Design an enzyme around this catalytic site. Sequence first.
Site, PDB file in Angstrom:
ATOM      1  CD  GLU A 143      -6.026  12.224   1.935  1.00  0.00           C
ATOM      2  OE1 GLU A 143      -5.412  11.978   0.483  1.00  0.00           O
ATOM      3  OE2 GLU A 143      -5.684  11.328   2.584  1.00  0.00           O
ATOM      4  CG  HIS A 147      -2.028   0.927   1.162  1.00  0.00           C
ATOM      5  ND1 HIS A 147      -3.107   0.772   0.491  1.00  0.00           N
ATOM      6  CD2 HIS A 147      -2.248   2.225   1.682  1.00  0.00           C
ATOM      7  CE1 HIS A 147      -3.976   1.811   0.517  1.00  0.00           C
ATOM      8  NE2 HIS A 147      -3.269   2.757   1.208  1.00  0.00           N
ATOM      9  CD  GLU A 204       1.595   7.989  -1.697  1.00  0.00           C
ATOM     10  OE1 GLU A 204       1.831   8.720  -0.612  1.00  0.00           O
ATOM     11  OE2 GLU A 204       0.671   7.526  -1.767  1.00  0.00           O
ATOM     12  CG  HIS A 235     -13.214   4.777   5.764  1.00  0.00           C
ATOM     13  ND1 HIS A 235     -12.752   3.846   4.916  1.00  0.00           N
ATOM     14  CD2 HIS A 235     -12.301   5.743   5.776  1.00  0.00           C
ATOM     15  CE1 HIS A 235     -11.793   4.119   4.321  1.00  0.00           C
ATOM     16  NE2 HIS A 235     -11.411   5.280   4.769  1.00  0.00           N
TER      17      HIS A 235
HETATM   18  C1  LIG Z   1      -4.315  12.732  18.263  1.00  0.00           C
HETATM   19  O1  LIG Z   1      -4.609  11.297  18.158  1.00  0.00           O
HETATM   20  C2  LIG Z   1      -5.105  10.817  17.238  1.00  0.00           C
HETATM   21  C3  LIG Z   1      -5.423   9.412  17.367  1.00  0.00           C
HETATM   22  O2  LIG Z   1      -4.875   8.908  18.443  1.00  0.00           O
HETATM   23  C4  LIG Z   1      -4.214  11.162  15.910  1.00  0.00           C
HETATM   24  O3  LIG Z   1      -5.120  10.887  14.828  1.00  0.00           O
HETATM   25  C5  LIG Z   1      -4.353  10.067  13.655  1.00  0.00           C
HETATM   26  O4  LIG Z   1      -3.809  11.070  12.670  1.00  0.00           O
HETATM   27  C6  LIG Z   1      -3.254  10.476  11.481  1.00  0.00           C
HETATM   28  C7  LIG Z   1      -2.717  11.651  10.796  1.00  0.00           C
HETATM   29  O5  LIG Z   1      -3.888  12.070   9.787  1.00  0.00           O
HETATM   30  C8  LIG Z   1      -4.286   9.262  11.013  1.00  0.00           C
HETATM   31  O6  LIG Z   1      -3.450   9.003   9.728  1.00  0.00           O
HETATM   32  C9  LIG Z   1      -4.218   8.560   8.569  1.00  0.00           C
HETATM   33  O7  LIG Z   1      -5.076   7.569   8.632  1.00  0.00           O
HETATM   34  C10 LIG Z   1      -5.680   7.520   7.252  1.00  0.00           C
HETATM   35  C11 LIG Z   1      -6.599   6.098   7.524  1.00  0.00           C
HETATM   36  O8  LIG Z   1      -6.218   5.254   6.618  1.00  0.00           O
HETATM   37  C12 LIG Z   1      -6.583   4.070   7.087  1.00  0.00           C
HETATM   38  O9  LIG Z   1      -6.809   2.819   6.154  1.00  0.00           O
HETATM   39  C13 LIG Z   1      -5.602   2.915   5.568  1.00  0.00           C
HETATM   40  C14 LIG Z   1      -5.894   1.662   4.384  1.00  0.00           C
HETATM   41  O10 LIG Z   1      -6.908   2.470   3.575  1.00  0.00           O
HETATM   42  C15 LIG Z   1      -4.164   2.230   6.107  1.00  0.00           C
HETATM   43  O11 LIG Z   1      -3.393   2.312   5.231  1.00  0.00           O
HETATM   44  C16 LIG Z   1      -3.888   3.435   7.322  1.00  0.00           C
HETATM   45  O12 LIG Z   1      -2.850   3.105   7.795  1.00  0.00           O
HETATM   46  C17 LIG Z   1      -5.012   3.750   8.043  1.00  0.00           C
HETATM   47  O13 LIG Z   1      -5.289   2.539   8.775  1.00  0.00           O
HETATM   48  C18 LIG Z   1      -4.717   7.353   6.161  1.00  0.00           C
HETATM   49  O14 LIG Z   1      -5.628   7.086   4.867  1.00  0.00           O
HETATM   50  C19 LIG Z   1      -4.034   8.720   6.047  1.00  0.00           C
HETATM   51  O15 LIG Z   1      -3.003   8.275   4.967  1.00  0.00           O
HETATM   52  C20 LIG Z   1      -3.021   9.488   4.056  1.00  0.00           C
HETATM   53  O16 LIG Z   1      -1.919  10.263   3.983  1.00  0.00           O
HETATM   54  C21 LIG Z   1      -0.756   9.500   3.575  1.00  0.00           C
HETATM   55  C22 LIG Z   1       0.202  10.509   3.649  1.00  0.00           C
HETATM   56  O17 LIG Z   1       0.539  10.678   5.076  1.00  0.00           O
HETATM   57  C23 LIG Z   1      -1.028   9.150   2.105  1.00  0.00           C
HETATM   58  O18 LIG Z   1      -0.241   8.471   1.325  1.00  0.00           O
HETATM   59  C24 LIG Z   1      -2.322   8.282   1.941  1.00  0.00           C
HETATM   60  O19 LIG Z   1      -2.661   7.586   0.655  1.00  0.00           O
HETATM   61  C25 LIG Z   1      -3.691   8.882   2.770  1.00  0.00           C
HETATM   62  O20 LIG Z   1      -3.884   9.949   1.585  1.00  0.00           O
HETATM   63  C26 LIG Z   1      -3.270   8.654   7.320  1.00  0.00           C
HETATM   64  O21 LIG Z   1      -2.255   7.607   7.546  1.00  0.00           O
HETATM   65  C27 LIG Z   1      -4.876   8.319  11.881  1.00  0.00           C
HETATM   66  O22 LIG Z   1      -5.866   7.605  11.181  1.00  0.00           O
HETATM   67  C28 LIG Z   1      -5.336   8.973  12.955  1.00  0.00           C
HETATM   68  N1  LIG Z   1      -5.901   8.052  13.875  1.00  0.00           N
HETATM   69  C29 LIG Z   1      -7.088   7.723  14.120  1.00  0.00           C
HETATM   70  C30 LIG Z   1      -7.615   6.984  15.072  1.00  0.00           C
HETATM   71  O23 LIG Z   1      -8.115   8.525  13.584  1.00  0.00           O
HETATM   72  C31 LIG Z   1      -3.701  12.478  15.590  1.00  0.00           C
HETATM   73  O24 LIG Z   1      -2.813  12.363  14.544  1.00  0.00           O
HETATM   74  C32 LIG Z   1      -3.084  13.005  16.856  1.00  0.00           C
HETATM   75  N2  LIG Z   1      -2.917  14.439  17.098  1.00  0.00           N
HETATM   76  C33 LIG Z   1      -1.857  14.695  17.616  1.00  0.00           C
HETATM   77  C34 LIG Z   1      -0.845  13.877  18.149  1.00  0.00           C
HETATM   78  O25 LIG Z   1      -1.312  15.984  17.443  1.00  0.00           O
END
Ligand SMILES: *[C@@H]1O[C@H](CO)[C@@H](O[C@@H]2O[C@H](CO)[C@@H](O[C@@H]3O[C@H](CO[C@H]4O[C@H](CO)[C@@H](O)[C@H](O)[C@@H]4O)[C@@H](O)[C@H](O[C@H]4O[C@H](CO)[C@@H](O)[C@H](O)[C@@H]4O)[C@@H]3O)[C@H](O)[C@H]2NC(C)=O)[C@H](O)[C@H]1NC(C)=O
Lengths: 596, 49
Positions: A384, A327, A357, A487
């Site tokens: 995004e 992925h 990316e 989701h």
């Molecule tokens: C406060 O605490 C919360 C939770 O504890 C944090 O929330 C997280 O934030 C991050 C940053 O945005 C989130 O990460 C995103 O998740 C998206 C969900 O995708 C899921 O499914 C795909 C498969 O389809 C998996 O591969 C993925 O790992 C996930 O399981 C992703 O889609 C996002 O990726 C996007 O960006 C990347 C580049 O970074 C692109 O390449 C991708 O194509 C995509 O567009 C991203 O990874 C995370 O989901 C949040 N957690 C929750 C539970 O929602 C906060 O960050 C935190 N805040 C602070 C600490 O300040």
Amino acid sequence: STIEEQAKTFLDKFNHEAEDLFYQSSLASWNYNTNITEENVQNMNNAGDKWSAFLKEQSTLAQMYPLQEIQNLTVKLQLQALQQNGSSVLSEDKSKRLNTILNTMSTIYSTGKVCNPDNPQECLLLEPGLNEIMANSLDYNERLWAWESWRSEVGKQLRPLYEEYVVLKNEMARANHYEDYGDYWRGDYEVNGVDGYDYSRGQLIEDVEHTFEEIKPLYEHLHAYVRAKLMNAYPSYISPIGCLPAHLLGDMWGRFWTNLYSLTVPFGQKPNIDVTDAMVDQAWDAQRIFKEAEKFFVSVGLPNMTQGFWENSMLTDPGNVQKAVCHPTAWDLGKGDFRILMCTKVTMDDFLTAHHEMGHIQYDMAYAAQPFLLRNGANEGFHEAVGEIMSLSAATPKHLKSIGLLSPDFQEDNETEINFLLKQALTIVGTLPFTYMLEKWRWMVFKGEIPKDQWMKKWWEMKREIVGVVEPVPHDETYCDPASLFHVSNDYSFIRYYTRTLYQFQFQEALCQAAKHEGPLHKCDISNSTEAGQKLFNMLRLGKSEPWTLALENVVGAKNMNVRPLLNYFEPLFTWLKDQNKNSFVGWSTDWSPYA
Amino acid sequence: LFRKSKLKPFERDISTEIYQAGNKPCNGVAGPNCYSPLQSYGFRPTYGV
Ligand SMILES: *[C@@H]1O[C@H](CO)[C@@H](O[C@@H]2O[C@H](CO)[C@@H](O[C@@H]3O[C@H](CO[C@H]4O[C@H](CO)[C@@H](O)[C@H](O)[C@@H]4O)[C@@H](O)[C@H](O[C@H]4O[C@H](CO)[C@@H](O)[C@H](O)[C@@H]4O)[C@@H]3O)[C@H](O)[C@H]2NC(C)=O)[C@H](O)[C@H]1NC(C)=O
Ligand SMILES: *[C@@H]1O[C@H](CO)[C@@H](O[C@@H]2O[C@H](CO)[C@@H](O[C@@H]3O[C@H](CO)[C@@H](O)[C@H](O)[C@@H]3O)[C@H](O)[C@H]2NC(C)=O)[C@H](O)[C@H]1NC(C)=O
Ligand SMILES: *[C@@H]1O[C@H](CO)[C@@H](O[C@@H]2O[C@H](CO)[C@@H](O)[C@H](O)[C@H]2NC(C)=O)[C@H](O)[C@H]1NC(C)=O
Ligand SMILES: *[C@@H]1O[C@H](CO)[C@@H](O)[C@H](O)[C@H]1NC(C)=O
Ligand SMILES: *[C@@H]1O[C@H](CO)[C@@H](O)[C@H](O)[C@H]1NC(C)=O
Ligand SMILES: *[C@@H]1O[C@H](CO)[C@@H](O)[C@H](O)[C@H]1NC(C)=O
């Protein structure tokens, strides 16, 4: 002394520990993802446990500073984020119950499997076969049966667990000062404390509705054209005025309409644009593609990648015993390390994904100077949109001609532009109503206005209303159709896929304005331009240090999302579809039901 | 990472005492508003320039 100095001291400490702990956890995660072994899982678990525990104690300690004595408004944001993102309020039994429920949801979604009727001999999973069947197979009975069977075998199990989960999340929200969990989600866009830029949580709802009021004609004309074209494929089943059957959308849930392009090509005789053979002839490999993307990024003025990126990142599948997930992801381990994890094939889609990316990587590098708690996009949508705007210019024929993959002999007229715009439309426009419907339904169910016994009843009723799609088989309250969505089961906010799209066309139309481009909007390039590059970088470097309304103002000049650029992008397609829909009825009828 | 005042040119300081920040004197023990003054670097080959 005063509270401000003590808070500043505490932050100056917290950043220092947080950097190292985050680096350790992220490195463990990357090591597991590039090397799938049990000890890597153990390392991930240990690092995550340490990080979560540390966040917990810091959240506990941060409580001693009341937030009404801070006037810098920059310390306040960091304090608010730290207090919110690590605070637990439920009792221990309730907390572990919710954790077990979420683990059960993930496990049942991962382990779900359905197979052929009255034959327990051989069975398959959703990813390998079911997606291929719904994307390629044209059999009415097979698609209908599989669509019914997966929902029957998943949602029925998931229903009561979701019923308990919604309640638990509701008390979680009620324990805080939010009205409900829906308001907890909506609080991401909240802006307070700044005059002329304040944004209220409820306002967003209204805004969304208003936006969806203006994009209706394009969607309904596209729906009419799609119905007319699919009349040829399945004449008996499809009604000229009824809603489309839910099992004939080319995928599992109808989220994307890409798979219908071959069945709904406007001009099949004319050749399609493709460079895969051209790349094959020129013997292109992964490093060449990524170097081309890097050169494109440099050509606008942004700095190019570090040596560590080239040394550490991996671009080709290791194969053999070494197994890893393919992925595509952009990792920012922090402390000056950025990497890209994806397996590359010699295809146009991979060529565009490289740019997509690299956009995220550049955005991550933009705000490296900000404090740790503010190293993120202005909201959940900006990231995004930034990652997606560049893929638009990457695929334009002008860029291909300048690079040289496309022969100079290529020409442009009606059919090329119309086919390109339609192909883009079935991917972009189609997903908007589905996302809006899902988000609104979840908002209503978390609001508690809908009783449990009507959960399915309302769900389909609005499906025939907005999406204009009718279920092919009746379902009772035993089924939980929304739970079948990835989701929904995994507790992810889905509204970000509606704010993102409307953002990107605002960005592009701005940059093409600064690039002094003339002609149709969809044929635009920013390769040589530099004013657009610096204008974009000015907003990119901000991070979370400013309200997102101000950041949006600094690029386009408005304090709210708008739909005009999106419509302006597809205007020729709108006119052509209006011409084509002269003899076809517009609007779906909710009374019709395929099952008599 | 924390000092009461600045330094004169060409000066060194090796004393390690708990840097009190809150009003209450914590009698030189670790705790809230009482941080050790000497931080620590972390060096790994995978860092960036
Ligand atoms: C406060 O605490 C919360 C939770 O504890 C944090 O929330 C997280 O934030 C991050 C940053 O945005 C989130 O990460 C995103 O998740 C998206 C969900 O995708 C899921 O499914 C795909 C498969 O389809 C998996 O591969 C993925 O790992 C996930 O399981 C992703 O889609 C996002 O990726 C996007 O960006 C990347 C580049 O970074 C692109 O390449 C991708 O194509 C995509 O567009 C991203 O990874 C995370 O989901 C949040 N957690 C929750 C539970 O929602 C906060 O960050 C935190 N805040 C602070 C600490 O300040
Ligand atoms: C809110 O708090 C932040 C941080 O406490 C304040 O930012 C600080 O702003 C000052 C000047 O406005 C910065 O001083 C500068 O330091 C550099 C060296 O780093 C020096 O070369 C400059 O000449 C200047 O003296 C200070 O660095 C900066 N803090 C951080 C951590 O970067 C901010 O000013 C506060 N808000 C208000 C309205 O005062
Ligand atoms: C941005 O500038 C580069 C530098 O000239 C352009 O690259 C040239 O493109 C033309 C085609 O228009 C080729 O004939 C040249 O051989 C290219 N030169 C080099 C050194 O590669 C590029 O086309 C420009 N971008 C756009 C969109 O016009
Ligand atoms: C993956 O993990 C194994 C198990 O310890 C280890 O021997 C190997 O060096 C790691 N890396 C690769 C690339 O296999
Ligand atoms: C881009 O990389 C090249 C090396 O391939 C380097 O010479 C150049 O300086 C880089 N661009 C910038 C803006 O530093
Ligand atoms: C094709 O484009 C030309 C532009 O000169 C226009 O005159 C013509 O009407 C167009 N035809 C269709 C079917 O859109």
